[PDB]
Amino acid sequence: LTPQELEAYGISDVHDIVYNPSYDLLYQEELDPSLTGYERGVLTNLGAVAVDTGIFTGRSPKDKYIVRDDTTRDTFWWADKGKGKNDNKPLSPETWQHLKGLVTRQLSGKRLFVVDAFCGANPDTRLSVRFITEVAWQAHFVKNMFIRPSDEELAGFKPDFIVMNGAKCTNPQWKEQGLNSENFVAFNLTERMQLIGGTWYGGEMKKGMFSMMNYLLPLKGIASMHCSANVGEKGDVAVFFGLSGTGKTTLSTDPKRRLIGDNEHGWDDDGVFNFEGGCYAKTIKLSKEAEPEIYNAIRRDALLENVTVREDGTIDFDDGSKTENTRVSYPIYHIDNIVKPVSKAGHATKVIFLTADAFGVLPPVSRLTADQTQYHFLSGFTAKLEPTPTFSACFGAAFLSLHPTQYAEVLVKRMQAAGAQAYLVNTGWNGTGKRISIKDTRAIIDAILNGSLDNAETFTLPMFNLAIPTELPGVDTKILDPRNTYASPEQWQEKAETLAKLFIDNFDKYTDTPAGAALVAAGPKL
């Protein structure tokens, strides 16, 4: 609020502070025709502002660093201490101070936007975050994606985390400091700050705080989950884990169910709760007949990123020539059917693992055993494209601050206490070399949530030993068995053996505990 207050963080000579801009103020700030470069917004015919995020159109895990100090040394899952790969690269406190002078100097003597907000729907576990930026649309991003405080909550607002966005500065000493590049996304848990240099991508702030929630919550016994969530009229809660592009936002935004959130949730003694106040949807080749809710949320106060807007202001949603990662964020009340005023609900009884399998091996749906649930949670499989595999522990290893086993343990405890069941859903590819359609996927989710799948007759799919139904109301029976989508079942066999090998090698790192070694029997077997 006052310059004396920003000076505590290291920023000086700030004349104009814009505290908690309203949506109307951000709209005017973004459309100021005097803006230059990547600060500029343009109005689209849908009424929503669109921006260009610059060189970076996604996260930069190679530039992510965590200060290694006595607070984090023995608790963090470090990239250099084994046994599993992750992006939590250690940083010295000395280099941290250098990066902090870079960002604070860049922000000094600027018009700064400051946004106070919450991460976490429950007062007992939420972080009070203070975001500092010089770009209006960046402030708009965090206004959309975090929980917007009431007037009364601003009154006594006490930040316990600061994120300073120094996107316009770069680090010229990076080669001497052993870093990946002149950009940086740095975290210091002793100071409780995130610094961002060089990249304008707003997702770094969203996932920065998620990584911070992923550090603190499981240490209190609370699951911290990379998943969307919604609840039926009968009060039944479902969560949908998955890696990028697998359908968390697409498939949780069903107007029969009340949306809880689309990306980040905790699970405590009272149930599943959203960390966020908005949604962040992929728009590449957006249909509108396939995703009407998401489409109609694109209006004033939504923020489009990197989409092509024509001279007449209309949007070419099919154009990925800047990036396939085109995006729109919006506050969650742009969705008509949501839980409100607080984004939370009871304990989940359906746990869905979304995966997009470019190898075309995995069945569209399968009810997992309790051990297959752990095996597939720790594996975190998806594949892209020709197919390249990704194994990302807990379906979100980019954001884990603790060891994967820690997340697995908390999830199992919550699931067992609630009597929850888990399901593996391939929203990716089959023998057709096409992605299964959203229509067919939505019907499969319906069969999961309404008990149809639990009461179906099943057989065991070989190799992966996954229980699959012979038929389901609403679904093409042909696709339920992935072997039928090839001309010869021997074609599937060949790819299943390839994929099973990748799973087996990947899981080996978990077999150094007796419990992990016993899970190998739940995995695929050659």
Ligand SMILES: Nc1ncnc2c1ncn2[C@@H]1O[C@H](COP(=O)(O)OP(=O)(O)OP(=O)(O)O)[C@@H](O)[C@H]1O
């Ligand atoms: N059968 C399907 N089920 C779900 N999504 C599908 C399907 N086929 C294609 N898609 C596309 O996949 C994308 C899913 O985007 P979505 O925002 O749901 O990703 P996400 O899982 O939330 O990941 P991110 O965290 O990157 O946003 C959309 O572009 C959607 O249209």
Ligand SMILES: [Ca+2]
């Ligand atoms: Ca994601």
Ligand SMILES: [Mg+2]
């Ligand atoms: Mg999404």
